[PDB]
Swiss-Prot record:
Disease: SRC kinase activity has been shown to be increased in several tumor tissues and tumor cell lines such as colon carcinoma cells. Thrombocytopenia 6: A form of thrombocytopenia, a hematologic disorder defined by a decrease in the number of platelets in circulating blood, resulting in the potential for increased bleeding and decreased ability for clotting. THC6 is an autosomal dominant form. Affected individuals may also have bone abnormalities and an increased risk for myelofibrosis.
Protein name: Proto-oncogene tyrosine-protein kinase Src
Tissue expression remark: Expressed ubiquitously. Expressed in the skin (at protein level). Platelets, neurons and osteoclasts express 5-fold to 200-fold higher levels than most other tissues.
Gene: SRC
UniProt remark on domains: The SH2 and SH3 domains are important for the intramolecular and intermolecular interactions that regulate catalytic activity, localization, and substrate recruitment.
Function: Non-receptor protein tyrosine kinase which is activated following engagement of many different classes of cellular receptors including immune response receptors, integrins and other adhesion receptors, receptor protein tyrosine kinases, G protein-coupled receptors as well as cytokine receptors. Participates in signaling pathways that control a diverse spectrum of biological activities including gene transcription, immune response, cell adhesion, cell cycle progression, apoptosis, migration, and transformation.
Lineage top rank: taxon: Eukaryota
Residues with PTM Phosphotyrosine: 43
Subunit and partners: Part of a complex comprised of PTPRA, BCAR1, BCAR3 (via SH2 domain) and SRC; the formation of the complex is dependent on integrin mediated-tyrosine phosphorylation of PTPRA. Interacts with DDEF1/ASAP1; via the SH3 domain. Interacts with CCPG1. Identified in a complex containing FGFR4, NCAM1, CDH2, PLCG1, FRS2, SRC, SHC1, GAP43 and CTTN. Interacts with ERBB2, STAT1 and PNN. Interacts with DDR1, DDR2 and DAB2. Interacts with CDCP1, TGFB1I1 and TOM1L2. Interacts with the cytoplasmic domain of MUC1, phosphorylates it and increases binding of MUC1 with beta-catenin.
Localization terms from the record: Cell membrane; Mitochondrion inner membrane; Nucleus; Cytoplasm, Cytoskeleton
Domain SH2: 7-104
Further remarks about this protein from its record: May be involved in blister formation in Pemphigus vulgaris, phosphorylated-SRC is abundant at blister sites but not in normally adherent tissue, which corresponds with loss and disruption of CDH1 in cells adjacent to blisters. Phosphorylated SRC is increasingly abundant at pre-lesional sites of blister formation and occurs prior to changes in abundance of CDH1 and DSG3.
PTMs per UniProt: The phosphorylated form is termed pp60c-src. S-nitrosylation is important for activation of its kinase activity.
Family: Belongs to the protein kinase superfamily. Tyr protein kinase family. SRC subfamily.
């Protein structure tokens, strides 16, 4: 049950996700998962980042879900659940702008 997850914001827009994440109190890695505005069945992982170049900014990654059961951002690294995916990206930055650190505050 993904909607039970505190990091799951469900049906919110891309603009809303960025409004929530662009708060100055948010450290790098602040994140949320929401439905994709356009892609049916896909989820979107929105993550805050920060650097002296760009300052505070937001990145979006598409989370695909296979009828065959797997969840993934890259087909090479798949998970049995969205929860396991989130747990894995909280420790490995891999190709993400930062590892997932803190759930986005409302
Ligand atoms: C998430 O589904 C998503 C992923 C990327 C790489 C980009 C964007 C847009 O900024 C996404 O949001 P979406 O609402 O699906 O367009």
């Amino acid at each position: 049950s993904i909607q039970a997850e505190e990091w799951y914001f469900g049906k919110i827009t891309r603009r809303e996700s960025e409004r929530l994440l662009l708060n100055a109190e948010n450290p790098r890695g602040t994140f949320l998962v929401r439905e994709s505005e356009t892609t049916k069945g896909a989820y979107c992982l929105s993550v805050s980042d920060f650097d002296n170049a760009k300052g505070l900014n937001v990145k979006h990654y598409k989370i695909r879900k296979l009828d065959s059961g797997g969840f993934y951002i890259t087909s090479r690294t798949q998970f049995n659940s969205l929860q396991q995916l989130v747990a894995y990206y909280s420790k490995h930055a891999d190709g993400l702008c930062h590892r997932l650190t803190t759930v986005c505050p409302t």
